[PDB]
UniProtKB/Swiss-Prot annotation, chain B:
Subunit composition and interactions: Interacts with TPL and TPR4. Interacts with BZIP30.
Stated family: Belongs to the WUS homeobox family.
Protein name: Protein WUSCHEL
Subcellular location: Nucleus
Organism annotation: Arabidopsis thaliana
Portion of the parent chain present: 39 to 99 of 292
Gene expressing this chain: WUS
Length: 64, 61, 64
DNA sequence: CACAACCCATTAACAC
DNA sequence: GTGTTAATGGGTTGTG
């Protein structure tokens, strides 16, 4: 089943992206982030992985 | 990363006789579990290998 | 595994979209489109349903 | 040229 | 219809 991000999960992710400058997190970091985001709903390490890749693609379309 | 010979035979086994192209993450680590016997190993290597091996079969087609 | 369109299947779909002006095909038309594309590879009626919606959205957003 | 490695664009599928 | 998650793929760099 698809992952649907909660408002809290999105803001924590955007926090790490914009204030901590996380772009391609190591698998160790992926486990740390998934661990924190699991408080708000079911989520896997691939979800945060795909989110960072998708968000970088989202950013590069804004600069266009 | 440098693959040992026995890892290549297991990968080519799974790819050519078991018809794995894009293994699911459970399968990725299940392959990794059997490959941990032969040397250094991570889950991303099997991901990268199957992605690269498909590109080669298909570039030559 | 998700459906990946073959080169000739995209050729036929984009033909139907741009030369036959098909946007939201009736379920009968899906069956007929499914018939021809299956003569070229593994597809389902759900694929042609998703594709015409997704290509219309992609063309919509591309205009924006 | 082969090899792993890892981006970058594209998009099918499904959530709403 | 809309938005985005989950992947598929092409191209590129590194190394030999």
């Amino acid at each position: 089943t698809r992952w649907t991000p909660t408002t809290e999960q999105i803001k924590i992710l955007k926090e790490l992206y914009y204030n901590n400058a996380i772009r391609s997190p190591t698998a160790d970091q992926i486990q740390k982030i998934t661990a924190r985001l699991r408080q708000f709903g079911k989520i896997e390490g691939k979800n945060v992985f795909y989110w960072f890749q998708n968000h970088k693609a989202r950013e590069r379309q804004k600069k266009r």
